[PDB]
Amino acid sequence: ERGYSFSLTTFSPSGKLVQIEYALAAVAGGAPSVGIKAANGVVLATEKKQKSILYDERSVHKVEPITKHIGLVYSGMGPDYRVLVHRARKLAQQYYLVYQEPIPTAQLVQRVASVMQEYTQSGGVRPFGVSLLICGWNEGRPYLFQSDPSGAYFAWKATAMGKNYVNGKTFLEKRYNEDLELEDAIHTAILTLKESFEGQMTEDNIEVGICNEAGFRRLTPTEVKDYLAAIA
Amino acid sequence: YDRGVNTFSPEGRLFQVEYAIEAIKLGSTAIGIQTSEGVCLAVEKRITSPLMEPSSIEKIVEIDAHIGCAMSGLIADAKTLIDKARVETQNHWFTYNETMTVESVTQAVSNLALQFGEEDSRPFGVALLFGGVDEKGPQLFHMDPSGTFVQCDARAIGSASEGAQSSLQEVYHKSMTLKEAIKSSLIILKQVMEEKLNATNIELATVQPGQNFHMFTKEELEEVIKDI
Amino acid sequence: SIMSYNGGAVMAMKGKNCVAIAADRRFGIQAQMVTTDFQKIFPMGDRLYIGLAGLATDVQTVAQRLKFRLNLYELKEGRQIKPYTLMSMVANLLYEKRFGPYYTEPVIAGLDPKTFKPFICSLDLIGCPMVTDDFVVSGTCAEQMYGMCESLWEPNMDPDHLFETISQAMLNAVDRDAVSGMGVIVHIIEKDKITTRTLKARMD
Amino acid sequence: TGYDLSASTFSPDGRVFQVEYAMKAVENSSTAIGIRCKDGVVFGVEKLVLSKLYEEGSNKRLFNVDRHVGMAVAGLLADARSLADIAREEASNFRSNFGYNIPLKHLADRVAMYVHAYTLYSAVRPFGCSFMLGSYSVNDGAQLYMIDPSGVSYGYWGCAIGKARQAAKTEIEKLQMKEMTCRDIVKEVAKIIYIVHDEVKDKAFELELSWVGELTNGRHEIVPKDIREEAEKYAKESLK
Amino acid sequence: SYDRAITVFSPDGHLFQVEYAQEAVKKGSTAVGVRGRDIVVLGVEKKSVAKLQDERTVRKICALDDNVCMAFAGLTADARIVINRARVECQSHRLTVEDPVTVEYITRYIASLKQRYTQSNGRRPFGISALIVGFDFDGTPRLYQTDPSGTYHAWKANAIGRGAKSVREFLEKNYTDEAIETDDLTIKLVIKALLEVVQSGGKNIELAVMRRDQSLKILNPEEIEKYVAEIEKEKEENE
Amino acid sequence: SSAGFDRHITIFSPEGRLYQVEYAFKAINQGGLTSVAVRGKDCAVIVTQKKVPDKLLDSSTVTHLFKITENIGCVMTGMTADSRSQVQRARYEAANWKYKYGYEIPVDMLCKRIADISQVYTQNAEMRPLGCCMILIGIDEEQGPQVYKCDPAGYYCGFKATAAGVKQTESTSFLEKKVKKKFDWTFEQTVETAITCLSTVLSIDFKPSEIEVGVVTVENPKFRILTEAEIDAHLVALAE
Amino acid sequence: NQYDNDVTVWSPQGRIHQIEYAMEAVKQGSATVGLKSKTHAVLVALKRAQSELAAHQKKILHVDNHIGISIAGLTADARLLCNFMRQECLDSRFVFDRPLPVSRLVSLIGSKTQIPTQRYGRRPYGVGLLIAGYDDMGPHIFQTCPSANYFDCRAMSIGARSQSARTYLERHMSEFMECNLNELVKHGLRALRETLPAEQDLTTKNVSIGIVGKDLEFTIYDDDDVSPFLEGLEERPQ
Amino acid sequence: LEGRTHIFKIHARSMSVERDIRFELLARLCPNSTGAEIRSVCTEAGMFAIRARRKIATEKDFLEAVNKVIKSYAKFSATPRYMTYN
Amino acid sequence: SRRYDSRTTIFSPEGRLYQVEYAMEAIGHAGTCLGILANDGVLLAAERRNIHKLLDEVFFSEKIYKLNEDMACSVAGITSDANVLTNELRLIAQRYLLQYQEPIPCEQLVTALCDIKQAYTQFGGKRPFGVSLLYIGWDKHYGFQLYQSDPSGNYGGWKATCIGNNSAAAVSMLKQDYKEGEMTLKSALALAIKVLNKTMDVSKLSAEKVEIATLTRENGKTVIRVLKQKEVEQLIKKHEEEEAKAEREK
């Protein structure tokens, strides 16, 4: 570039970060998605609906598995999403080359969290408008993590990203609990993503990825209509 | 209207440089004189308090053997020009086994006068006067922040610059003698100082073809005071 | 030679539920006896050790860089390191210098941190790993170590028979070679606790 | 409000005014047209006499980029000379890696890529130049290309640059592209340039005609104005 | 990197961020110091301790060499940076040219560095002003001072910080050569200046001394209350 | 709902919006063009018209269909120079695919790469978002024909029959009604629709010279530009 | 006027005001007139000083044996481009061991001055350069501008009221191509002498003159060198 | 430069001038003051002269209030009027 | 492109650093932590921000980090902005250990980090680090220490703390509750649960809303101690019983 590289994010009179707030708003305007960590492994359930029946959902996926044991979903803007996904995809490898061993979920969130962190403060460029929900199964116990535009991360048994995520968050608070099997997590995830879904739900209106302790798996529209038919 | 610091004026020229010309108007005033007997230069230290130690103020350091110089306005900006110019003369003595002429030091500074920019930093706000003896003898020079150079005979800078140049061109001629120019200069100096004249208030810069170096010293000056 | 300049030998051997590792105490330049206090076998974590043989500068340097990477690793992740991770880590560390390769013989003897499972491995100086279920030997002379170990080692040993076994192997393995000698130290570790002894070696 | 400043910036209408300003600044230059015949390409330029001012045969907007390829430029002159260095070096590169005449299409595509590349950034400014490009070969024929300050590279049989543009390229429809030989299009474009541009707008001017094609055997230079001298002869009588 | 005009010449001729950056020094903690025939004694005040907390970790006086002591103003962080820089400098001057460092030399280094620092693009001019005291080789007294412009300047005694014009106004009465004709008169003289400066609560007052060629030493506040007791009984004898 | 430089640069507005890309998507319509993509069973058809204001225009130079690879064709929209730069980036990156991996690029991963490049174009605040849009075709193993559309938001997507641009928003509304029903697709069926949708959107009903038809099929897997003759054959074929 | 910030911006009319203000920076310099005949080429420049004892500040400066230059504007860029000029001279003078044809030289001046006329946060150079030289086709008189567009003339002038010097030029400048060096030089000072208000000379030390010829190497002439050129002059009318 | 001494002359008709007072010194020591700032100089003269009860104010007497008014009052703000129209 | 720059590095016409003021105001909100002197030990207590029971809480030490075998820190501010600093400082301490094969003394570590933070204050137009954290550790000389990282690049190394702006009343409470050489880490701990029992606005003092970590001297381990909820619960309810004994005077 021109070498200007000044961070456009300054501190507000209260110290808040304007552009990060606005990116949080853009995530809030993202697509409704959910994920549940319980018992055998993690279950991630997002929502992908076509603005026109011309669109073909067999083409692009909202779920992009990082490794056979670790998947990932998101909310917010796909353009950024695909980018940082390519980045983390490349990044797990160096860890592999060093140790010859699958990189732990925690460590992924660590390094990607740092990439996003520096990416905020980086020179003359906006932050991301994406909030990730990362799943993974390691050492017998699976894990579910969540990112934010500022790079911070947490852990949940279930959560939601996108519109209504507070409402469906409280729904997951009461209904979902404890630790229950993939069938139950998928059930209540289809209920809570059925909340803000349109009047019709089809195999192509949503996407369900699952983290078994046998390894991550991406379900096809076949099984998606199988369990949800018979929705909830 | 904050524009690039490199922008020309509508009349016009560089803003910050033309302002740096005004930056010297407030600095310490000095008067040099070029006379066939030798170059004599003089400055007022402009001392404030008894805290202020009088020998710690020097507006004149001898650049080379045969080259003196004076400064104005800001000081630590001039330090770099002074030192690096000494380096240039000494490298001239490297190659050519001679004395770098007083006139070639001038352009050896004013050629690097304006390098300042952002990409690819601030201009210097200090005027200089060059005394020295080359093969043609005594030479008094004058330079500005923008790098424009002109050779003078008796030149002033600082706050008194205007009226000291008036009364100076009033009292000057080409038949001057050394001490005549010294005392005639300190006449203007003691008209342009607020405090009474003493040994501390001023310092003299003098160079002559065979009388050297010199530089100059006090207690000669302390005699020149009462010599008025 | 290059490796035989400072000399030295490192031997590690897997027991039943434990693992033994031993090396000589000697230091010196060629035939000159310098100091017998020198340390080669170094601790990494707990219930896990590592040995080194070759140039003492490469010994100390590798121990330092290694201990560095391990400290960062376990500082970032509360778990203690696994032996395989340490293996591939050292291999990576030795291959990082291909045309500028160090001179050493890394020998890793340590238990699994999760279970008690014993484990041993030895590498090549450029980073080629190797794993065996009986013993890994690295050092000056071959017929000594491979000879006596192939002539002795048994599948299942109590810590005692393991101890005396690697003891006679290191004694009679040293007594034929002059550049190795001057005292031997033996580390024998188990899941419960670590035991170390000092053999009585001929100072000849 | 601020949307005109940087070329990096869009506008509420979805375009850049830097390109608009630069474009209409090129319109203020003197009219220089071009045309291609069946056996070559005829460049033509009208250079203005302002005061005296200075010697004739100076700062001619007609350039020679290659042995077979040359320029007829209009607009800001310094940037146009810079573009002449650009295309000059580019033909030197094609000649370097390959060793034959650059096909005009790729040359104009490279210059178009630069001109485009300086419209995306607030470091530089959009170029103040628009020029004609023409070439000939027996394995190609007579090709003409017209390049704009935005970076669009296409071609014509003829085109018009400068103040008088549409009213100048209007009657060029009377000039037939193929049927007319180039030696005749010399005096044709002479009559267009002399007949257009009324003498009251600029009290005095002159005519420059550069030419490339089959008659000169691929060599691009000025078909000498003292050769044939057909402008003045015909153009002076052509006012009526 | 970052290339931009930090501070320019306003059309009046002056800079801004420099002459104005002096204001952080003007609001900084008060500190003073004097030079004498034998022992040099500096001064500092406005400690403003929480009285439950440690003074040596916030300590405001250090030394580059055992020969040269440091006293600064402004904000603490930049003082840290310039102090370390100068430590590297005096160390390099100790490497080659085996003699100890001369105060004029180091102070030219600090000052010049602070100048070329206020020159280059993308540099916030240091808002710290410092003083450099010690004992010359050949046993002479020495002090200098600094400015946001980077001008090394030798004084007889120091007036910086808040109320520095009032401080120096009292140093008009200080400077008489009888003060100090005695050494504890120089100590009680600096305590008699800082006793007039600021609050002088007898607690936040701290001073460091360097006696001739002896290494630096700081009196524990028994002699702060002792010299304050003799200055108080002296004010009583003034009646 | 805007504060600061956000209208001049790429950041987020009080609501999270960024004005630059929405200025780009309407920076496409400056061309006043129409892009039509239809996918058949074994074939994929592209059709686009053009405007010829001058008789000096060469029909061969203003062709808006570009052949990236032997099996890969494409069509652009929006401003021109951006489209060309996009085109050399495309061809370039395809060739790098063949150099690195040695087999032909699926073209889907090409939309991914070009898309990510567009995202890098959206990121830097000192660079322009480059508001041209891109549509592709090709053939893949057991996928038959495919269509994909890369837009300057930093994303790609591809469908059965897709159109984007000036009048294309209603052409989708005509399209979805034409595609279903149950409609099965032959080659001349998808060509015929390729004309119809643009017709009922425009209803110019004109010479075959103005439109340009790009095609790809699994009979001849290579991309192909249609000659006006066979086009006119389909034109009198669709008029009964 | 905020669109006149830096060079980068195109004005609403499409004219960068930075280069215009650089031209106005050129117009403030002291007038000078260069001219050539069919054989010899001459440039004449008038100095201006700050005060009495201050030396009249010179303009004409020698570059290469066959090429000298006049000047106006910033002395900084003058000496800078002058140094780059010495470089260019000894370049071909080194490798090719020949002098430099003026044309391609001045195009090198245009290429060197071009880039600062565009890049963000850059300025043009205040330039009053007037170049005189001999390649195999003999005399040349060029001129420059901050916009880096050069002209080739029989006589041109820059500075204060230099268009009045041209109003003297037009008449006799068809004859300037004929006469020899001397009376051509007095034609030159007849062009400069109107740039002065009519109440003052036109003395010796206040003026600088330079001549170069076909077989004559470029030489600066001032004071006693121009005293033969200044003598035999008829004073301007009243 | 000498123009300020005229404001010092019209404003010198006020109060009382000790015959030693040298105007040009004061005028060259205060650039960019227009006539209003130096009118407040001639003002603070008699002000601190009243605070000292002296009927006349020596140049050295009030010049402390001069460098104090132009220095202290130029520290915080004012005089960017060029900058206001430039 | 120059008008787009916010000129963060420049001062503010009053002499103050305008950006650093806000850099203090960032810690003005958010985290609430503490730390106090202790003989043969040290104490750190930090309020756990998100009290939502849906969290997994498998991170072990969260707001407290372990940067060294003998040292640790408690952060207040932007969490990831801090993480960069924890990786950084951890790498610095670890490379000193690499150098001398000797545990790093706390001081040069703290100061060097604070200067690294200062590099963004002196130049660059960058967003300065809005993170301020504490420090604990043992050394061969001064033993147990506390230090305070500041946003301005200064270190204010203390023996008592203020985190965050809420904790000023806790500093006054400490000055009323101070002491000389009493540990009795249990005493100063009940003092701490008292501090947060007042300052911290959420009543009842739920054990999981806060967190406590200590570091005691050992041979040669220098134990780093993170605790289970229950043995803290008996301390909490124990202290509430101590207040029940304190109101007995009325």
Instruction: Tokens for F145, please give them.
Output: 């024909």
Dist CA F133 CA F80 (whole Å): 10
What values do phi and psi take at B92, rounded to 5? Answer: -60, -40
Instruction: Tokens for F234, please give them.
Output: 């389909």
Which residues neighbour G208 within 8 Å (Cβ) at sequence distance 6 or greater?
A: G44, G45, G46, G47, G58, G59, G60, G220, G221, G222
**Chains with at least 3 CB pairs less than 8 angstroms from chain I:** A, B, C, D, E, F, G
Dist CA G98 CA G104 (whole Å): 14
Contact indicator for A41, A186 with CB cutoff of 8 Å: no
Instruction: Tokens for G58, please give them.
Output: 């010179």
Instruction: Tokens for I121, please give them.
Output: 């204050």
Of B3, B114, B154, nearest to G6 by CB-CB distance is B3
Contact indicator for C100, C127 with CB cutoff of 8 Å: no
Identify the bridge partners of residue B151 per DSSP, sorted by sequence position: B141
Dist CA I112 CA D126 (whole Å): 48
Amino acid at A35: G
Nearest CA among A117, A114, A98, A135 for reference residue A217: A135
Which residues neighbour G194 within 8 Å (Cβ) at sequence distance 6 or greater?
A: G161, G164, G165, G168, G236
Identify the bridge partners of residue F45 per DSSP, sorted by sequence position: F38, F215
CB contact under 8 A, H28 and B160: yes
Q: Choose the mutation target among E8, E9, E10, E12 for the interface with H, i.e. most H CBs under 10 Å.
A: E12
Dist CA I11 CA E124 (whole Å): 8
DSSP characters over A54-106: T--TTT--S---SBTTB-EEEEE-HHHHHHHHHHHHHHHHHHHHHHSSPPPHH
Dist CA A68 CA A215 (whole Å): 6
Domain ranges across chain C:
1-204
Dist CA I44 CA I39 (whole Å): 14
Angle, CA C143 vertex, CA C142 and CA C147 arms, to 5°: 115
3-state DSSP call for residue F109?
Answer: helix
Any E CB within 8 A of H73 CB: no
Instruction: Tokens for I57, please give them.
Output: 């809480």
Dist CA D109 CA D35 (whole Å): 20
Question: What would the CATH number be for the domain defined by D1-240?
Answer: 3.60.20.10
Contact indicator for A106, C77 with CB cutoff of 8 Å: yes
Dist CA C52 CA C94 (whole Å): 13
Ramachandran assignment for G136, one of left (phi > 0), alpha (psi -120 to 50 degrees), beta (any other): alpha
Task: Please tell me what DSSP assigns to residue F53.
Answer: -
Using alpha carbons, list the distances in angstroms from residue B187 to B224, B226, G54: 11, 12, 21
> What resolution does the deposited structure have, in angstroms?
3.8
Dist CA I178 CA B100 (whole Å): 73
Dist CA A127 CA D197 (whole Å): 57
CB contact under 8 A, C75 and I66: yes
Handedness of CA B79, B85, B91, B96 (dihedral sign): negative
What is the strand order of the sheet I132-139 is part of?
I64-65, I71-76, I132-139, I143-148
Burial label, F30 (beta-carbon count in 10 A; 0-12, 13-18, 19+): middle
Task: Please tell me what DSSP assigns to residue C104.
Answer: B
Cis before residue C7, ω within 30 degrees of 0?
A: no
Contacts of B75 in chain E (CB under 8 A): 149, 151
Structural domains in chain A plus CATH codes: 1-232 (3.60.20.10)
Contact indicator for G135, G143 with CB cutoff of 8 Å: no
Dist CA A185 CA E165 (whole Å): 76
Beta-sheet pairing, I132-139 with C120-123: unpaired
Dist CA A179 CA A161 (whole Å): 21
Instruction: Tokens for D224, please give them.
Output: 């000498």
A132-151 burial: b if 16+ Cβ within 10 Å, else e:
bbbbbbbeeebbbbbbbbbb
Question: What would the CATH number be for the domain defined by C1-204?
Answer: 3.60.20.10
Question: Could you tell me where the DSSP H helices lie in C77-158?
Answer: 83-95, 142-150
Dist CA B184 CA B190 (whole Å): 10
Contacts of B194 in chain H (CB under 8 A): 25, 60
Rg (chain H; Cα; Å)? 13
Angle, CA E220 vertex, CA E214 and CA E224 arms, to 5°: 105
User: E strands within D82-185?
Assistant: 129-137, 141-147, 153-156, 158-161
Q: After which residues is chain G broken (C to N over 2.5 A)?
A: none
Contact indicator for A158, A37 with CB cutoff of 8 Å: yes
Give the gap in angstroms from C-alpha G205 to the nearest C-alpha of chain D.
30
Dist CA D211 CA D206 (whole Å): 17
Instruction: Tokens for G116, please give them.
Output: 């600062």
Q: Which helix (H) or strand (E) holds G219?
A: strand G219-222
Nearest CA among D234, D208, D214 for reference residue D34: D208
What values do phi and psi take at A207, rounded to 5? Answer: -150, 135
Say which residue the tokens 């304050």 belong to.
E228
How many DSSP H helices and E strands does chain C contain? 4, 12
Nearest CA among D210, D240, D214, D205 for reference residue D227: D210
Amino acid at B128: L
3-state DSSP call for residue A10?
Answer: coil
Dist CA B43 CA B73 (whole Å): 12
Dist CA C161 CA E154 (whole Å): 82
Instruction: Tokens for B54, please give them.
Output: 């009088």
CB contact under 8 A, A106 and C77: yes
Any C CB within 8 A of I58 CB: no
CB contact under 8 A, E1 and A5: yes
Q: Choose the mutation target among I1, I2, I6, I10 for the interface with B, i.e. most B CBs under 10 Å.
A: I2
Domain ranges across chain D:
1-240
3-state DSSP call for residue I231?
Answer: helix
Dist CA E202 CA A162 (whole Å): 63
Using alpha carbons, list the distances in angstroms from residue C123 to C94, C127, C137, C138: 9, 6, 10, 9
Dist CA B33 CA B41 (whole Å): 6
Residues in chain E: 239
Rg (chain C; Cα; Å)? 16
Say which residue the tokens 């004599």 belong to.
B40
Using alpha carbons, list the distances in angstroms from residue I182 to I146, I178, I235, I243: 16, 10, 18, 21
Task: Please tell me what DSSP assigns to residue I116.
Answer: H
How many DSSP H helices and E strands does chain B contain? 6, 9
Instruction: Tokens for E8, please give them.
Output: 């320019």
What values do phi and psi take at D69, rounded to 5? Answer: -135, 135
Ramachandran assignment for G192, one of left (phi > 0), alpha (psi -120 to 50 degrees), beta (any other): alpha
Dist CA I11 CA E19 (whole Å): 12
Instruction: Tokens for A105, please give them.
Output: 């979920």
Which residues neighbour A5 within 8 Å (Cβ) at sequence distance 6 or greater?
A: A123, A124, E1, E2, I125
Amino acid at I148: Q
What values do phi and psi take at G63, rounded to 5? Answer: -125, -70
Handedness of CA H58, H59, H60, H63 (dihedral sign): positive
Which residues neighbour B25 within 8 Å (Cβ) at sequence distance 6 or greater?
A: B158, B159, B161, E13, H31
DSSP characters over G5-45: SSTTPPPTTS--HHHHHHHHHHTTSPPEEEEE-SS-EEEEE
Which chain G residues in 106-145 lie under 8 Å from chain I, judged by CB atoms? 120-121
Dist CA C53 CA C2 (whole Å): 12
Using alpha carbons, list the distances in angstroms from residue H83 to B4, G8, I10: 15, 23, 19
Dist CA D97 CA D75 (whole Å): 33
Which residues neighbour I14 within 8 Å (Cβ) at sequence distance 6 or greater?
A: E23
Nearest CA among B63, B124, B122, B115 for reference residue B88: B63
What does the H/E/C string look like for chain E? CCCCCCCCCCCCCCCCCCCCCHHHHHCCCCEEEECCCCEEEEEECCCCCCCCCCCCCCCCEEECCCCEEEEECCCHHHHHHHHHHHHHHHHHHHHCCCCCCCHHHHHHHHHHHHHHHHHCCCCCCCCCCEEEEEECCCCCEEEEECCCCCCCECECECCCCCCHHHHHHHHHHHCCCCCCCCHHHHHHHHHHHHCCCCCCCCCCCECEEEECCCCCEECCCHHHHHHHHHHHHHHHHCC
Dist CA F94 CA F88 (whole Å): 10
Which residues neighbour A81 within 8 Å (Cβ) at sequence distance 6 or greater?
A: A74, A130
Q: What share of chain C is helix, strand, coil (3-state, %, to 5)?
A: 30, 25, 45
Which residues neighbour E171 within 8 Å (Cβ) at sequence distance 6 or greater?
A: B51, E157, E159, E193
Using alpha carbons, list the distances in angstroms from residue B159 to B19, B26, B164, B165, H34: 15, 5, 9, 11, 17
Contacts of G121 in chain I (CB under 8 A): 2
Amino acid at H77: S
The experimental method, as deposited, was cryo-EM
Give the gap in angstroms from C-alpha I124 to the nearest C-alpha of chain B.
13
Contacts of F131 in chain D (CB under 8 A): 10, 14
Angle, CA F205 vertex, CA F200 and CA F207 arms, to 5°: 145
Dist CA E76 CA E74 (whole Å): 7
Amino acid at F97: W
Chain CA centroid to CA I135, Å: 6
Task: Please tell me what DSSP assigns to residue B50.
Answer: T
Handedness of CA I129, I135, I138, I142 (dihedral sign): positive
Dist CA A104 CA A106 (whole Å): 5
Give the gap in angstroms from C-alpha B28 to the nearest C-alpha of chain G.
21
Beta-sheet pairing, E68-72 with F155-157: unpaired
Which residues neighbour G104 within 8 Å (Cβ) at sequence distance 6 or greater?
A: none
Burial label, E139 (beta-carbon count in 10 A; 0-12, 13-18, 19+): exposed
Contact indicator for G133, G66 with CB cutoff of 8 Å: yes
Residues in chain C: 204
